[PDB]
């Protein structure tokens, strides 16, 4: 069976896609965090695995395991690291799973990786991991391995279909934990894993132009989302869920054109 | 849904049961690895986490995402650490990660925790990450958090099951990689993942009593497993299955009494 | 003489003001890095230094020697760290810092801090290094540290003030690398070290929706900027200046109010 | 006087047998833990040095100075790191030691080190240190650096000599924690250090197929062993010691054959 | 503005003076540290930065932002690290930020460093710092960048200026913390920074030849000095300065020759 | 027998002595280092191993098995780390190591720990590790740790006694690598291991006010040393040994005055 999912593949038949020349290797990045009262907790890790699948579908690459847990929730992006449920690592803890993962993959022959982070906290970690690794690279003498990282969320840039999203006016990425953008990608893949009709609605969340610590838990809506998700719908996440698809889709097109 | 996998619970499902008391904790702990011809390498993942789910579900425990990824493999246990596809961590990368996880799980109210092994490569960095959680657990003033650890394999013990297994004589968990003991147990929970029909048979692995490296590939069996998986058959992983299952979810019930 | 600078004071001057209760320290964190061909490369040191210094002349508070060096600079944010003159650290080198000195202003007694980034691709870093002192502390029982952090250019919310800045729409901080934002602020504060007539107008940086490493020299604008300065004023940088010192110490007082 | 270990030469003494070519070092590691009422501490350091000694002094190669301490003790296989006397590291601490030493080594220009093992415990630290370590030398432009690891007990394979040395049936390696073996061995070589009048029989240690942390002391035989040692006698250390030193003289010659 | 700090000029300017070959660059390490009821606390870093500018104005080098934070201060050479204001940096932070900031003047193309100490402590972590990272760029190739390292202070050696110095017989560099040399030298320095009425003269601090932990305050001098700087004078501080600038300049010009 | 060496012991009897009350532990921490052509490597671990011996005999402390590896050799002061037979650790590895066997000591019970340095890089390393393993301990509750550090040359401070050891004048501490104290002690206690013979002669060693990396080899006398030890006699060695022995034993009771 034709998976996209190197974990389901043999050594052999991985060994054979790698030398075939210009393999493409995706890693999904996310998080095992608390999302409401309405969506289970796999969310970020779900999200950006679909999204890898799909796209390797479409062009032929192969998808890594997805790291299942990422940094540290933060208050203005996920609700804060005090609530239960959410699991994270440490900043070095993942910058060095990015890190190790690379070194392998170079191991294995692979020279084109693209990380998808489905967890806003993640970035700069990831960026790490890979700086990291590929100054290693460079020590063993390998010059040709190149990353693309993105955050899925970030391809759905088009005005008009983030006016079809959002009737009401964009209100962020920031705030859109748990909201309509999670929750109704969610519809559309995995519907038993959400139920509209738990979803605290409160005003989008609000906060001023710095930070506490330790996290003051008042300051995050009760629920744990930073906005509502009542307007989600599984249409909205069918329309995401082909922007994404297609426009990463090309993006890899563009950075690993086929040699 | 009654999902057993704490990640497809919401927050408030998840801070409940953690709330009631005495809830348990299951973490399986697994690897990307060559697994031979006839099968994928997800299996050290698929496994612990398919025996964590119904030993899970037969005592009312949660299981967390599943490490994805082990500790390197070696020649005499993994085949070694020069194949394609199988992608390593560093030891500090996982002990740090099962650190983390226990540091979390304990913020959450959580004390009681199963890891379950299903990488051999696994152990000694799984115990070395228990021992500093617990360390820094000691430090912000818990005591009441305790840890089984376990590699399920090891619960298939009598003599009897072992004979009925292995009509030959048992050779040892040691070359069980990629052999009976796995293939069997995927046989009859992942079929589609298994092809008997490219099982290169070939005689048990042998080795000197000690180890070389860098690692010498010669001296591991070309298919990439320890011994050979040809006698593999679904009936022994139900089996396998059973045993494990209910050997697990005793000992479980022994350590973790209800309170 | 009255310095609001912790360097310039003697041990029992800040003793006695640490014993006095309530007293709030400030950290400026910052980056050695390239700053176009028209402005020096310790903006981002000397920017969150002097709004410290204001700040805590109008609050009582005292200045820390600022973090000069900061973590590598990013394309998207600050032209990338492949450009000479910039000097950068690794990410555990930035979060030990941060840690090290909390740890130590907790020995000294203190309770209350401020982090001012001024350097974009800090913030995470601080934000590691915050949580892991925290950690420390309750591991010690200090549980009542607070810290607040904020990246002074945040402050500047008010739409009339993004307007009187930016007669022409605002583009947004990710591209305020060497721009009218800074080489203002700059032009009031230290005009020596700005010369209007080198900026390289060119039109503010655009990027896909991903990152690509190795960084592309190519996708960075030839002068190191993001966006061009050349309608920098000093009126602006004024009217920045006031809106942050005001802002932060309004804030300060929120979060730090005197006991 | 042609010591056989690399502290008692002067530099110009080894400096001069590196440069005469395939010059073969041994580096003992071992563990300072509790052995029973009836030993001292530092056996599983002792041990590997005789053997390493006698090796040496057979295919004239050096033998290092031995790593005293060794990675914290486990419960099934030395007790339990509970007790008093055993004094352990942390595996990073283990790891890094054996990294530093092979860097070195490689420095000196040495490229054949045989690691012997006395500790049950060490054994994936040191595999991890020689990893890292091999890895930095590739990043040097060495490729020609080769390792043997092994534990001197596993050299007694012959059922015969096992016969001999268990007419009992032979329990394994597991429990062999002050036992019989080590007991043995350590009556040939350093009787003072054992008193056979102190040795608390008792049945070989039996455990479920699972660990506990924290360590519960109530599974570890008080008097700290695994297993008894009263039927150990100096002559069935004497045919240990043999049987390793001879097998191992011949594992070095056929990995490490003259040039 | 020919100004002599990296951090005032352009990226440009400064890749300019680098490609010109054979440039040097100086890098101030300091600390933040209690000198007493008549001193400031950033000495360690001010004193070292302007002897930097000196001689870097006398051979046209360019000095870096100092390092603000050093190691933990020591009993015998700082008084001790229980003093409040004094914030001191782990070990593993300050050779990691003196390893960062050598790797990245190398990525600039830079060969040539001067490491200019202010803070007694700093010594060995500095050097394993430069260790580090000589290490690491001989695995990128690069085997051309040389290092020299000292303490401005040990420039101070012709018997006629020490007896003129200290015209009561030398005491040491040891005791020599807030005494008369730095006082002296900060008071033709910054003499704003000091102010000579407030210094608490007692006899030279003296101790056994061991050293205790926890640090004992009761064995350092109450105002934090280990000698008193009473007869210090800016007179002395001119000396000092111009055998430090002219001597480290000559140095400079030994190990660094123009090509 | 009573040995002083707690490998030598049981772990019963090492359980008595520490609850016996303020039982006194003793780390001998040297280096595997070229001491010319005359000496051989283990020299700084010998040499403090035997004075620990004889001062534990006299006051009845324990003495635990010794640090075999040290810092990286210096230029000025042990003739640098480009020497073959030198085999130093890195800094981190060291200060771990201490690190470890102070948190077990203090699991064992024992709260009185004296290092007994012999190689002069090791120490700002073993200051770190003593500072981590009692940040460590209050974390842990444990305030009443005490240790004592020292280097045991540094009890040679008698003029007389000086002057009697070096009829010449002192040259100082700096340069007593391989020179008369070492090769001296080393004649009174393992002359099998010293060959005055092979003493290459030669002017103390000599350097400018600052060091250079990578070290330059030209700039260390050849035969490793840098002072000659031809004047070097067994006498010299006896009072040295007294001498140390017995200033030790006393500072011993005055910072731990039995209870
Ligand atoms: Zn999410
Ligand atoms: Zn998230
Ligand atoms: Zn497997
Ligand atoms: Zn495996
Ligand atoms: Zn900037
Ligand atoms: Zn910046
Ligand atoms: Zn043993
Ligand atoms: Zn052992
Ligand atoms: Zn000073
Ligand atoms: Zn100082
Ligand atoms: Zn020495
Ligand atoms: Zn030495």
Redesign the pocket.
Known sequence: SKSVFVGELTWKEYEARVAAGDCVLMLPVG?L?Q?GHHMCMN??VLLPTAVCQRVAERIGALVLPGLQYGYKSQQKS?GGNHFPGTTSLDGATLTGTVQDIIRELARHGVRRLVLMN??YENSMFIVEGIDLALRELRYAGIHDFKVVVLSYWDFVKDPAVIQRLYPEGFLGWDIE??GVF?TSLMLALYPDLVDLERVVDHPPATFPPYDVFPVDPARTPAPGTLSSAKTASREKGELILEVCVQGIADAIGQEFPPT
Do not use: L
């Open positions: 998080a965090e999302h969310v970020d996920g489905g967890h934990h748990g999670e």
